[PDB]
Antibody, heavy 219, light 215 residues
Framework: QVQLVQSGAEVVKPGASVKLSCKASGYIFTSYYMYWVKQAPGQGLEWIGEINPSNGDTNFNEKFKSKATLTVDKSASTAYMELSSLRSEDTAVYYC???????????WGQGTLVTVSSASTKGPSVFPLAPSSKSTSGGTAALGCLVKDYFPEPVTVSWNSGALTSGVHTFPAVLQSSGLYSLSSVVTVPSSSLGTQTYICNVNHKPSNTKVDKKVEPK | IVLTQSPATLSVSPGERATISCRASQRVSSSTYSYMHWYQQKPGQPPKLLIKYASNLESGVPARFSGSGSGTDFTLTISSVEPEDFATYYCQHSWEXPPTFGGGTKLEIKRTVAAPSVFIFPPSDEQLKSGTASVVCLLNNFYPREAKVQWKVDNALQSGNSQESVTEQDSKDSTYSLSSTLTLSKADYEKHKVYACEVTHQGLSSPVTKSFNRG
């Protein structure tokens, strides 16, 4: 399987730099061009530029030639993009994507959200949303995790290490009055098996290197 | 090169044909081949390659997708829409440097009216220990998106101190879910008795209240 795994979200102070990585596996790294692509929030997509990992040859969008610096480590099968002199308009999801012929872009990393802000990174607190008599409905129980007071985005939430995905809703974040974000992740399950199944939410906030697993049990 | 996608949004029922357009500001075809590609972006995911060189299905992509066109005018077609086709669709040319992308078409999926199922969650004992009380009201698997949530505390309508968030359309059933969270200090929380989420939605003939008594 072709895979591109990107580095984690980070907050960057205005004016500073950040260096993003893109680890390639499942193919010969030097046999495909690596592209990088910007997607601003709500926005669409902009090509930043290209690197040929066999030799380090690059080309850039004129729009990004002063903003972006591209390199590789062939022995780590990893491409890098360094973004310089970061401003507000640079807050965006950045993708790496491979191109076999400089035509289509056939495999994509998962994206790195770069937030440009003077505000400090903070990890979330995680609290259970326990299933109880007030969270049942026609043979189903709802349960969840409240992920509160983090910065910047994003948080990810899985259930049972990714084995529980049916019926999971991880809501879009809200901006609190504090300037910190919060969200909940919920799931509906059979009320019959509240005694016998185990539900754990796996919360990850990469900007603060914070990981919390919370077993959510009946109240 | 500027790629202009139309329409901006397209609303379609499962089983029906979907057709979206991408116009290039100049020609992106040689005499034999066309350098337009189409991607699908589902929420939180990167774009995924569907079609390359105008009409070549990417391996692994379902057969309901096709593409056509030459010169400047290109189309993507879903022959028979599935609910999992909820997505934004982008075109991209590879004729000149730099490659550029269109502004996207958002595909919305129509379905029948579904009333929300409503669940309420008192604050955890953990959270209360830290000085704050979040009360979460969940509205699950409803359609259409329009819904109203009001909080009542000892029957009194609350005027602020809540925030709502709505999901995107579900990829399997095309519904929405919504969370409303009421946030109070522990001290404010403990001065009242009854906490209620009152939910209005067109699939309900009168508002539905879910409540609990503190303790």
């Amino acid at each position: 399987q072709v895979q591109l795994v990107q580095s984690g979200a980070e907050v960057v102070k205005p004016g500073a730099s950040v260096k993003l990585s893109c680890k390639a596996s499942g193919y010969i790294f030097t046999s495909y061009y690596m592209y990088w692509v910007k997607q601003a929030p709500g926005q669409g997509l902009e090509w930043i530029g290209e690197i040929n990992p066999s030799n380090g040859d690059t080309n850039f969008n004129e729009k990004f030639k002063s903003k972006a610096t591209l390199t590789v480590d062939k022995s780590a099968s990893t491409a890098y993009m360094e973004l310089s002199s970061l401003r507000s308009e640079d807050t965006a999801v950045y993708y790496c994507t491979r191109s076999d012929g400089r035509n289509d872009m056939d495999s994509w990393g998962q994206g790195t959200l770069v937030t440009v802000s003077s505000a400090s990174t903070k990890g979330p607190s995680v609290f259970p949303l326990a299933p109880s008599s007030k969270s049942t409905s026609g043979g189903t129980a709802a349960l969840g995790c409240l992920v509160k007071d983090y910065f910047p985005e994003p948080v990810t939430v899985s259930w049972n290490s990714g084995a529980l995905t049916s019926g999971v809703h991880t809501f879009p974040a809200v901006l609190q009055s504090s300037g910190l974000y919060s969200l909940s992740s919920v799931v509906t399950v059979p009320s019959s098996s509240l005694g016998t199944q185990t539900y754990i939410c796996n919360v990850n906030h990469k900007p603060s290197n914070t990981k919390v697993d919370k077993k959510v049990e009946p109240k | 090169i500027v790629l202009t996608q139309s329409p901006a949004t397209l609303s379609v029922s499962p089983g029906e044909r979907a057709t979206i357009s991408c116009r290039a500001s100049q020609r992106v075809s040689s005499s034999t081949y066309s350098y337009m590609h189409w991607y699908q972006q589902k929420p939180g995911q990167p774009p995924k390659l569907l079609i390359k060189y105008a009409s070549n299905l990417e391996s692994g992509v379902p057969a309901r997708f096709s593409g056509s066109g030459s010169g400047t005018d290109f189309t993507l077609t879903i022959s028979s829409v599935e609910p999992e086709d909820f997505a934004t669709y982008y075109c991209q040319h590879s004729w000149e440097x730099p490659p550029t992308f269109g502004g996207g078409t958002k595909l919305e999926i129509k379905r029948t009216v579904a009333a929300p199922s409503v669940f309420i969650f008192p604050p955890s004992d953990e959270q209360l220990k830290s000085g704050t009380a979040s009360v979460v009201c969940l509205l699950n698997n409803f359609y259409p998106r329009e819904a109203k949530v009001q909080w009542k505390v000892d029957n009194a309508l609350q005027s602020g101190n809540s925030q709502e968030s709505v999901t995107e359309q579900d990829s399997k059933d095309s519904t929405y879910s919504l969370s409303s969270t009421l946030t109070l200090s522990k001290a404010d929380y403990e001065k009242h008795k009854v906490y209620a989420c009152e939910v209005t939605h067109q699939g309900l003939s009168s508002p539905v209240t879910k409540s609990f008594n503190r303790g």
